[PDB]
Amino acid sequence: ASAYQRFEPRAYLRNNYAPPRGDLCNPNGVGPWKLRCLAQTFATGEVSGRTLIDIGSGPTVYQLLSACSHFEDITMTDFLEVNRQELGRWLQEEPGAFNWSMYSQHACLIEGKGECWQDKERQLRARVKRVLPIDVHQPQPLGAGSPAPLPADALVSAFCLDAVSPDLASFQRALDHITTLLRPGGHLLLIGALEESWYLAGEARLTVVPVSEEEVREALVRSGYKVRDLRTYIMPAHLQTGVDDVKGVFFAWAQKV
Ligand SMILES: Nc1ncnc2c1ncn2[C@@H]1O[C@H](CSCC[C@H](N)C(=O)O)[C@@H](O)[C@H]1O
Ligand SMILES: NC[C@H](O)c1ccc(O)cc1
Numbered sequence: 001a002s003a004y005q006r007f008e009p010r011a012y013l014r015n016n017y018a019p020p021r022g023d024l025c026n027p028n029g030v031g032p033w034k035l036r037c038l039a040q041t042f043a044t045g046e047v048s049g050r051t052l053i054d055i056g057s058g059p060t061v062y063q064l065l066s067a068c069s070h071f072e073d074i075t076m077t078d079f080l081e082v083n084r085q086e087l088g089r090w091l092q093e094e095p096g097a098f099n100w101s102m103y104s105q106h107a108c109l110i111e112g113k114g115e116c117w118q119d120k121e122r123q124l125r126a127r128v129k130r131v132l133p134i135d136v137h138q139p140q141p142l143g144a145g146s147p148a149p150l151p152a153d154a155l156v157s158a159f160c161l162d163a164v165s166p167d168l169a170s171f172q173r174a175l176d177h178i179t180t181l182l183r184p185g186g187h188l189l190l191i192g193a194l195e196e197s198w199y200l201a202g203e204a205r206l207t208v209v210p211v212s213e214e215e216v217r218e219a220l221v222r223s224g225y226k227v228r229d230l231r232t233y234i235m236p237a238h239l240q241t242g243v244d245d246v247k248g249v250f251f252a253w254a255q256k257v
Pocket of ligand 1: 004055056057058059060063078079080083134135136137157158159160163164
Protein backbone atom coordinates (compact mmCIF):
# COMPACT_ATOMS: atom_id res chain seq x y z
CA ALA A 1 0.00 0.00 0.00
CA SER A 2 2.88 2.41 0.74
CA ALA A 3 3.80 1.46 -2.83
CA TYR A 4 0.93 3.77 -3.84
CA GLN A 5 3.01 6.65 -2.47
CA ARG A 6 5.20 6.54 -5.59
CA PHE A 7 2.29 6.14 -8.13
CA GLU A 8 2.49 8.53 -11.12
CA PRO A 9 -0.89 9.35 -12.69
CA ARG A 10 0.72 10.54 -15.92
CA ALA A 11 2.71 7.35 -16.30
CA TYR A 12 -0.34 5.28 -15.50
CA LEU A 13 -2.53 7.01 -18.08
CA ARG A 14 0.22 6.74 -20.70
CA ASN A 15 0.59 3.01 -19.94
CA ASN A 16 -3.02 2.11 -20.13
CA TYR A 17 -4.86 4.82 -21.98
CA ALA A 18 -2.51 5.95 -24.81
CA PRO A 19 -1.51 3.97 -27.78
CA PRO A 20 -1.68 1.02 -28.15
CA ARG A 21 -4.22 0.19 -25.48
CA GLY A 22 -5.58 3.68 -25.98
CA ASP A 23 -5.71 3.70 -29.77
CA LEU A 24 -9.44 3.00 -29.97
CA CYS A 25 -9.47 2.41 -33.68
CA ASN A 26 -9.37 -1.35 -33.59
CA PRO A 27 -12.80 -2.56 -32.36
CA ASN A 28 -11.04 -5.69 -30.99
CA GLY A 29 -9.03 -3.56 -28.60
CA VAL A 30 -9.59 -3.36 -24.86
CA GLY A 31 -10.88 0.22 -24.77
CA PRO A 32 -13.74 -0.54 -27.13
CA TRP A 33 -14.56 -3.72 -25.20
CA LYS A 34 -14.81 -1.82 -21.88
CA LEU A 35 -16.87 1.04 -23.30
CA ARG A 36 -19.15 -1.38 -25.12
CA CYS A 37 -19.87 -3.31 -21.88
CA LEU A 38 -20.60 -0.15 -19.98
CA ALA A 39 -22.76 1.14 -22.83
CA GLN A 40 -24.67 -2.07 -23.49
CA THR A 41 -25.37 -2.35 -19.77
CA PHE A 42 -26.84 1.14 -19.18
CA ALA A 43 -28.60 0.92 -22.55
CA THR A 44 -30.83 -1.70 -20.86
CA GLY A 45 -32.07 1.08 -18.63
CA GLU A 46 -32.40 -1.26 -15.61
CA VAL A 47 -29.57 0.60 -14.01
CA SER A 48 -30.98 3.98 -13.04
CA GLY A 49 -31.34 6.47 -10.22
CA ARG A 50 -30.31 9.83 -8.82
CA THR A 51 -26.91 9.33 -7.14
CA LEU A 52 -23.95 7.19 -8.18
CA ILE A 53 -20.40 6.81 -6.86
CA ASP A 54 -17.19 5.84 -8.64
CA ILE A 55 -14.78 3.89 -6.45
CA GLY A 56 -11.07 4.38 -7.06
CA SER A 57 -11.42 6.55 -10.12
CA GLY A 58 -7.77 7.25 -10.19
CA PRO A 59 -6.97 9.74 -12.96
CA THR A 60 -9.54 8.32 -15.35
CA VAL A 61 -13.08 9.25 -16.47
CA TYR A 62 -14.03 6.71 -19.19
CA GLN A 63 -15.77 4.43 -16.77
CA LEU A 64 -18.35 7.17 -16.37
CA LEU A 65 -19.16 8.24 -19.97
CA SER A 66 -22.15 6.09 -20.89
CA ALA A 67 -23.10 6.24 -17.26
CA CYS A 68 -23.46 10.01 -16.66
CA SER A 69 -26.70 10.20 -18.69
CA HIS A 70 -28.70 8.14 -16.13
CA PHE A 71 -27.61 9.71 -12.79
CA GLU A 72 -27.75 13.41 -12.00
CA ASP A 73 -25.44 13.33 -8.95
CA ILE A 74 -22.09 11.69 -9.53
CA THR A 75 -19.41 11.31 -6.89
CA MET A 76 -15.85 10.45 -7.87
CA THR A 77 -13.23 9.06 -5.45
CA ASP A 78 -9.58 8.18 -5.07
CA PHE A 79 -7.11 7.25 -2.38
CA LEU A 80 -4.30 9.54 -3.54
CA GLU A 81 -4.29 13.33 -3.51
CA VAL A 82 -2.38 13.42 -6.82
CA ASN A 83 -5.11 11.63 -8.74
CA ARG A 84 -7.86 13.77 -7.29
CA GLN A 85 -5.73 16.62 -8.60
CA GLU A 86 -5.45 15.14 -12.08
CA LEU A 87 -9.22 14.56 -12.20
CA GLY A 88 -9.66 18.17 -11.24
CA ARG A 89 -7.57 19.35 -14.13
CA TRP A 90 -9.89 17.60 -16.56
CA LEU A 91 -13.11 18.44 -14.69
CA GLN A 92 -12.36 22.17 -14.75
CA GLU A 93 -10.86 22.12 -18.27
CA GLU A 94 -7.66 23.47 -16.71
CA PRO A 95 -4.25 23.44 -18.44
CA GLY A 96 -2.50 20.12 -19.04
CA ALA A 97 -5.54 17.92 -18.61
CA PHE A 98 -5.46 14.45 -20.08
CA ASN A 99 -7.25 14.09 -23.40
CA TRP A 100 -10.22 11.78 -23.09
CA SER A 101 -11.79 12.93 -26.29
CA MET A 102 -11.08 9.71 -28.25
CA TYR A 103 -12.92 7.89 -25.46
CA SER A 104 -15.88 10.32 -25.37
CA GLN A 105 -16.15 9.88 -29.16
CA HIS A 106 -16.33 6.07 -28.92
CA ALA A 107 -18.73 6.45 -26.06
CA CYS A 108 -20.87 8.36 -28.51
CA LEU A 109 -20.13 6.05 -31.40
CA ILE A 110 -21.27 3.01 -29.37
CA GLU A 111 -24.35 4.45 -27.72
CA GLY A 112 -25.62 5.33 -31.18
CA LYS A 113 -27.67 8.32 -30.07
CA GLY A 114 -25.86 10.55 -32.52
CA GLU A 115 -24.62 12.68 -29.57
CA CYS A 116 -21.60 14.80 -30.21
CA TRP A 117 -18.62 14.13 -27.94
CA GLN A 118 -18.39 17.69 -26.50
CA ASP A 119 -21.94 17.28 -25.37
CA LYS A 120 -20.98 14.05 -23.59
CA GLU A 121 -17.96 15.58 -21.87
CA ARG A 122 -20.07 18.60 -20.88
CA GLN A 123 -22.79 16.34 -19.40
CA LEU A 124 -20.16 14.48 -17.40
CA ARG A 125 -18.34 17.56 -16.15
CA ALA A 126 -21.67 19.07 -14.99
CA ARG A 127 -22.96 15.92 -13.27
CA VAL A 128 -19.73 15.32 -11.33
CA LYS A 129 -20.51 17.23 -8.20
CA ARG A 130 -17.51 16.15 -6.05
CA VAL A 131 -14.17 14.33 -6.04
CA LEU A 132 -13.60 12.63 -2.64
CA PRO A 133 -10.77 10.85 -0.84
CA ILE A 134 -11.48 7.19 -0.09
CA ASP A 135 -10.07 4.09 1.54
CA VAL A 136 -11.73 0.79 0.62
CA HIS A 137 -9.96 -0.94 3.47
CA GLN A 138 -11.91 1.04 6.08
CA PRO A 139 -15.37 -0.37 6.94
CA GLN A 140 -16.70 3.11 6.21
CA PRO A 141 -14.63 3.94 3.10
CA LEU A 142 -15.75 7.52 2.72
CA GLY A 143 -15.46 8.44 6.38
CA ALA A 144 -18.11 9.53 8.83
CA GLY A 145 -19.72 12.72 7.52
CA SER A 146 -18.97 12.51 3.80
CA PRO A 147 -20.59 15.10 1.51
CA ALA A 148 -21.72 12.13 -0.58
CA PRO A 149 -25.42 11.30 -0.68
CA LEU A 150 -25.78 7.94 0.98
CA PRO A 151 -26.70 5.31 0.24
CA ALA A 152 -25.80 5.56 -3.48
CA ASP A 153 -28.28 4.30 -6.10
CA ALA A 154 -25.39 2.56 -7.83
CA LEU A 155 -21.61 2.03 -7.90
CA VAL A 156 -18.99 1.84 -10.62
CA SER A 157 -15.45 0.66 -10.07
CA ALA A 158 -12.65 -0.22 -12.42
CA PHE A 159 -9.24 -1.67 -11.63
CA CYS A 160 -9.53 -0.72 -7.99
CA LEU A 161 -10.23 -3.62 -5.69
CA ASP A 162 -8.12 -6.05 -7.71
CA ALA A 163 -5.36 -3.43 -7.64
CA VAL A 164 -5.33 -2.50 -3.95
CA SER A 165 -5.80 -5.91 -2.33
CA PRO A 166 -2.72 -8.09 -1.48
CA ASP A 167 -4.73 -11.32 -1.50
CA LEU A 168 -8.15 -12.84 -2.10
CA ALA A 169 -9.59 -12.28 1.37
CA SER A 170 -8.37 -8.66 1.37
CA PHE A 171 -10.25 -8.32 -1.89
CA GLN A 172 -13.37 -9.87 -0.35
CA ARG A 173 -13.44 -7.47 2.61
CA ALA A 174 -12.80 -4.47 0.40
CA LEU A 175 -15.91 -5.57 -1.49
CA ASP A 176 -17.95 -5.92 1.66
CA HIS A 177 -16.82 -2.40 2.62
CA ILE A 178 -18.03 -0.55 -0.49
CA THR A 179 -21.14 -2.67 -0.79
CA THR A 180 -22.24 -0.85 2.38
CA LEU A 181 -22.41 2.39 0.32
CA LEU A 182 -24.78 0.77 -2.14
CA ARG A 183 -28.49 0.97 -1.39
CA PRO A 184 -30.30 -2.39 -1.25
CA GLY A 185 -31.57 -3.14 -4.73
CA GLY A 186 -28.89 -0.94 -6.27
CA HIS A 187 -26.44 -1.82 -9.01
CA LEU A 188 -22.70 -2.39 -9.08
CA LEU A 189 -20.77 -2.10 -12.29
CA LEU A 190 -17.38 -3.64 -11.67
CA ILE A 191 -14.40 -3.96 -14.01
CA GLY A 192 -10.97 -5.27 -13.19
CA ALA A 193 -7.88 -7.23 -14.18
CA LEU A 194 -7.73 -11.04 -14.60
CA GLU A 195 -4.66 -12.87 -13.32
CA GLU A 196 -2.72 -9.66 -13.08
CA SER A 197 -0.02 -9.79 -10.41
CA TRP A 198 1.81 -6.49 -10.88
CA TYR A 199 1.65 -3.33 -12.97
CA LEU A 200 3.83 -0.21 -13.20
CA ALA A 201 2.97 3.40 -12.80
CA GLY A 202 6.26 5.22 -13.17
CA GLU A 203 8.56 4.72 -10.19
CA ALA A 204 5.83 2.74 -8.31
CA ARG A 205 5.58 -1.01 -8.73
CA LEU A 206 2.26 -2.32 -7.49
CA THR A 207 1.75 -5.89 -6.32
CA VAL A 208 -1.67 -7.20 -6.99
CA VAL A 209 -3.86 -10.22 -6.44
CA PRO A 210 -4.24 -12.29 -9.61
CA VAL A 211 -7.99 -12.97 -9.58
CA SER A 212 -10.03 -15.26 -11.88
CA GLU A 213 -13.62 -15.13 -13.19
CA GLU A 214 -15.03 -17.79 -10.83
CA GLU A 215 -13.25 -15.98 -7.95
CA VAL A 216 -15.02 -12.75 -8.91
CA ARG A 217 -18.38 -14.52 -9.16
CA GLU A 218 -18.05 -16.27 -5.78
CA ALA A 219 -16.95 -13.00 -4.16
CA LEU A 220 -19.83 -10.87 -5.42
CA VAL A 221 -22.16 -13.61 -4.30
CA ARG A 222 -20.63 -13.66 -0.80
CA SER A 223 -21.03 -9.88 -0.46
CA GLY A 224 -24.71 -10.37 -1.22
CA TYR A 225 -25.06 -9.67 -4.94
CA LYS A 226 -27.13 -11.20 -7.68
CA VAL A 227 -24.77 -11.53 -10.64
CA ARG A 228 -26.66 -10.19 -13.67
CA ASP A 229 -23.74 -10.29 -16.14
CA LEU A 230 -20.13 -11.39 -16.07
CA ARG A 231 -17.89 -11.15 -19.16
CA THR A 232 -14.31 -11.80 -20.01
CA TYR A 233 -12.05 -10.06 -22.46
CA ILE A 234 -8.73 -11.77 -23.15
CA MET A 235 -5.81 -9.43 -23.53
CA PRO A 236 -4.44 -9.98 -27.09
CA ALA A 237 -0.77 -10.37 -27.83
CA HIS A 238 -0.27 -6.86 -29.12
CA LEU A 239 -1.74 -5.27 -26.12
CA GLN A 240 0.75 -6.94 -23.79
CA THR A 241 3.42 -4.35 -23.33
CA GLY A 242 5.50 -4.88 -20.23
CA VAL A 243 3.70 -2.30 -18.08
CA ASP A 244 2.04 -5.27 -16.54
CA ASP A 245 1.31 -8.94 -16.77
CA VAL A 246 -2.51 -8.84 -16.99
CA LYS A 247 -3.96 -11.80 -18.93
CA GLY A 248 -7.54 -10.60 -19.49
CA VAL A 249 -10.19 -8.16 -18.22
CA PHE A 250 -13.51 -8.78 -16.53
CA PHE A 251 -16.73 -6.93 -16.40
CA ALA A 252 -19.54 -7.54 -13.87
CA TRP A 253 -23.03 -6.19 -13.50
CA ALA A 254 -24.14 -6.97 -10.01
CA GLN A 255 -27.33 -6.22 -8.10
CA LYS A 256 -27.58 -5.98 -4.29
CA VAL A 257 -30.37 -8.23 -3.01
N1 LIG B 1 -6.85 1.86 -0.18
C1 LIG B 1 -7.45 2.29 -1.42
N2 LIG B 1 -8.77 2.41 -1.52
C2 LIG B 1 -9.33 2.83 -2.69
N3 LIG B 1 -8.53 3.11 -3.75
C3 LIG B 1 -7.22 2.96 -3.63
C4 LIG B 1 -6.67 2.56 -2.48
N4 LIG B 1 -5.33 2.51 -2.62
C5 LIG B 1 -5.05 2.90 -3.92
N5 LIG B 1 -6.20 3.18 -4.54
C6 LIG B 1 -6.40 3.65 -5.94
O1 LIG B 1 -6.81 2.67 -6.85
C7 LIG B 1 -6.56 3.18 -8.12
C8 LIG B 1 -6.12 2.01 -8.98
S1 LIG B 1 -5.73 2.43 -10.68
C9 LIG B 1 -7.39 2.34 -11.42
C10 LIG B 1 -7.84 3.70 -11.97
C11 LIG B 1 -9.09 3.66 -12.85
N6 LIG B 1 -10.35 3.32 -12.17
C12 LIG B 1 -8.86 2.81 -14.08
O2 LIG B 1 -9.99 2.48 -14.78
O3 LIG B 1 -7.78 2.80 -14.52
C13 LIG B 1 -5.41 4.14 -7.93
O4 LIG B 1 -5.85 5.38 -8.42
C14 LIG B 1 -5.20 4.20 -6.52
O5 LIG B 1 -4.91 5.49 -5.96
N1 LIG C 1 -4.50 -3.03 -12.69
C1 LIG C 1 -4.35 -2.09 -13.78
C2 LIG C 1 -3.77 -2.76 -15.04
O1 LIG C 1 -2.43 -2.34 -15.31
C3 LIG C 1 -4.71 -2.35 -16.19
C4 LIG C 1 -5.48 -1.20 -16.15
C5 LIG C 1 -6.28 -0.90 -17.24
C6 LIG C 1 -6.33 -1.72 -18.38
O2 LIG C 1 -7.13 -1.39 -19.50
C7 LIG C 1 -5.57 -2.86 -18.44
C8 LIG C 1 -4.77 -3.15 -17.34
